[model samples]
Target: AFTGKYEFESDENYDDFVKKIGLPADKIEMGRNCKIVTEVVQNGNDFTWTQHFPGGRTTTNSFTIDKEADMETMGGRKFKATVKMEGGKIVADFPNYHHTAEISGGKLVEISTSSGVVYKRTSKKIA
Candidate 1:
């Protein structure tokens, strides 16, 4: 399934999403300029998903399908969520938002929705 590396390419409605999430203006601007990479290593129903951000910062978490795991957000907030596969995609219901990730046309496609507003991000495969 999702077992490779993906690098961020473009985003849709990301600024609005950041604003809705209550991040500062400077943080929003920096987020727009920052590059992000995602790496997924799947072993059966377990997964090691790692996100690489700017300034050599990284967040890595491991979880099993259909099981709850402790997770951290971009804002450094901690929470718990269960990651599952649905309709050929990996979906996770995070606090205040629903996130779905899939590989489409050899690219990683991520969608996040909160209070009817949707944010989309696409990444190209790097490995």
Candidate 2:
């Protein structure tokens, strides 16, 4: 599988924050690991996000997201949230990540973490 990653910001106004982190708008390549973008919308204590990408060339590929509350990490920081895809679905593990991030101007952007956080956007969807 080809490996790629998408970058994102952590501030509410991600447009500028991402720019400060040297994230380019054209980073979301079609065949790259970062194929699409999503925004986590906050709804009460839970959040949801959606994404759309070109289907793989030889397969209808997809991934799933999984989550855990107060999940511990090796850095000793309690995971405020974590999202991963498995089995054709993107499962967000955050307890309160609510927002919708869409692809605009040929780019996808998101606001996660605290300062400048990159979501490491990944997908099995082949080009």
Candidate 3:
């Protein structure tokens, strides 16, 4: 169900969110308005997911459901995280936060939470 190409629609609390995550000010400013696209493909328990940022930069990663994998964030941070399906949502833990992604109302909805601040991103399916 998470298979498809989605483009960033909007973000809530993104500026503060990126700041909390240690992004540089200029990067945060551009990022807040950058065009981001995400693609996902899933076959059985394996998955390939990619995020395309502005200027042709991309962050791509893959993992099996319920298994740990090395991942690189769009900002170029690398870390290991386990991904799983919980209540039909893809959930993972990253440094200082937990992320949950799900499709809601035909849109990809992703939420990242840390230190009581919640960042919400929604992307519309385009393919």
Against the unseen true structure, what C-alpha lDDT does each candidate score?
A: 0.81, 0.36, 0.83
Q: Which prediction has more favorable TM-score, 1 or 2? A: 1
Q: Quick one: best TM-score, which candidate? A: 3
lDDT of 1 by residue, 26-68 (tens): 6677667567878888788877778887885578877788999
Alpha-carbon lDDT of model 2: 0.36
Give the runs in model 2 whose Cα sits over 4 Å from its true position.
Answer: 1-3, 7-63, 66-76, 80-93, 99-102, 112-127
How many pairs of residues collide in model 1? 0
Task: For residue 47, give model 1's deviation from the true position in Å.
Answer: 2.0
Q: Per-residue CA lDDT of candidate 2, range 1-127, in tens?
A: 1122323322244444345544556632433443343334434333333343446322112222344434442213444455554442334444333322333343343324324443332222222
> Which pairs of residues collide in candidate 3?
none
- Candidate 2 shows a clash count of 17
- Whose lDDT is greatest here? 3
RMSD of 2: 12.2
Kindly report which residue pairs in candidate 1 clash with one another. none
